[PDB]
Ligand binder design. Structure first.
Ligand SMILES: CC[C@H]1OC(=O)[C@H](C)[C@@H](O[C@H]2C[C@@](C)(OC)[C@@H](O)[C@H](C)O2)[C@H](C)[C@@H](O[C@@H]2O[C@H](C)C[C@H](N(C)C)[C@H]2O)[C@](C)(O)C[C@@H](C)CN(C)[C@H](C)[C@@H](O)[C@]1(C)O
Ligand SMILES: Nc1nc2c(ncn2[C@@H]2O[C@H](CO)[C@@H](O)[C@H]2O)c(=O)[nH]1
Length: 287
């Protein structure tokens, strides 16, 4: 999309933009634009790639309104949120990392403030009450629903895209160990990793950016994005700090997280069902 097209689309929503912008396509279903308005204010624009996304946009608007109350980090403040344009003022800090693909870290990987601040944020997110989640017509998995639905995902992935025989055995084992699965499921961001976490250079986590995925689900899923990028020792430090704050853990949180992470290619496939290049990338990461 051209700058002038973007300017016109924003002007159709009463947002008057300069021609100074930069772009981000690392996202999946929306086009992202860093824009600047005629008043000097920096904006983040999310342009739906497709028509018919109204229900997702409304859902995420609800989620942001809901989580805004319960957190001490910034979240996007949607000022425009039609089916044609989502827009909010850019948040305070830049993401911990960017991806081209290739990781471009923006803070020191070993930043210790990141662990304590991230643990605080995970605690706040995971404290949000279930009645509010359900009120907002959000998806509610409960631990009884967890295992057979992941079984269904195995089913729909193996035949549709193929699965590694080793990948299949692990996933069947993981569903097997009743010990790994938590007694309790709590509201989760659902798409949480350093690329969606905003922080200063010292690693103090200022904000969380993409909330469309958030629903009540297993706690480990919020943990897994972290262990993939910072490693297992980091993860353990995060678990500790998280518990110290008062976060609901169980005896196998760490290992369940490890299994969630290992199950990345599986949930990759199932969400891919869409694009042939994403199906290609999965198929590789799965066989
Ligand atoms: C540490 C860097 C790596 O990062 C990761 O591995 C992440 C922790 C991983 O994420 C991990 C962890 C976790 C918790 O997501 C944060 C989990 O849901 C998934 C499936 O895998 C990402 C976010 C996944 O992308 C997520 O795939 C979901 C199915 C949809 C979701 N979004 C669009 C709603 C999307 O962000 C994905 C499936 O890996 C994207 C895929 C298309 C491209 N990957 C293969 C790249 C090359 C990555 O390997 C990586 C960038 O090099
Ligand atoms: N600096 C910054 N980047 C953002 C913000 N919102 C989204 N992004 C980027 O846009 C991508 C898709 O949402 C993210 O992965 C970030 O890189 C924001 O408020 N600030």
């Amino acid at each position: 999309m051209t700058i002038q097209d973007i300017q016109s689309l924003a002007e159709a929503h009463g947002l008057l933009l300069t021609d100074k912008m930069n772009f981000n396509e690392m996202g999946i279903d929306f086009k992202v634009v860093f824009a600047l308005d005629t008043k000097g204010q920096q904006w983040l624009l999310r342009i739906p790639r497709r028509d018919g996304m109204r229900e997702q946009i409304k859902k995420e608007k609800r989620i942001l309104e809901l989580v805004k109350k319960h957190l001490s980090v910034e979240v996007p403040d949607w000022r425009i949120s039609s089916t044609e344009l989502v827009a909010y003022p850019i948040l305070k800090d830049n993401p911990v990392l960017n991806l081209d693909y290739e990781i471009i870290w923006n803070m020191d990987k070993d930043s210790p403030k990141y662990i304590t601040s991230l643990a605080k944020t995970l605690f706040e997110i995971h404290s949000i009450p279930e009645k509010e989640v359900r009120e907002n017509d959000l998806k509610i998995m409960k631990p009884s629903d967890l295992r057979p639905e992941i079984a269904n995902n195995l089913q729909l992935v193996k035949s549709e895209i193929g699965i590694s025989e080793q990948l299949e055995t692990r996933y069947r084992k993981w569903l097997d160990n009743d010990v790994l699965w938590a007694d309790f499921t709590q509201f989760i961001h659902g798409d949480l990793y350093a690329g969606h976490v905003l922080a200063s250079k010292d690693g103090a986590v200022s904000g969380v950016i993409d909330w469309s995925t958030a629903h009540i689900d297993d706690p480990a899923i919020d943990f897994a994005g972290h262990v993939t990028l910072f490693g297992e020792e980091s993860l353990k430090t995060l678990i500790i700090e998280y518990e110290k704050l008062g976060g609901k853990v169980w005896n196998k949180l760490y290992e369940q997280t490890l299994e969630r992470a290992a199950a990345s290619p599986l949930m990759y496939g199932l969400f891919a069902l869409n694009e042939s290049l994403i199906v290609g990338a999965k198929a590789q990461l799965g066989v």
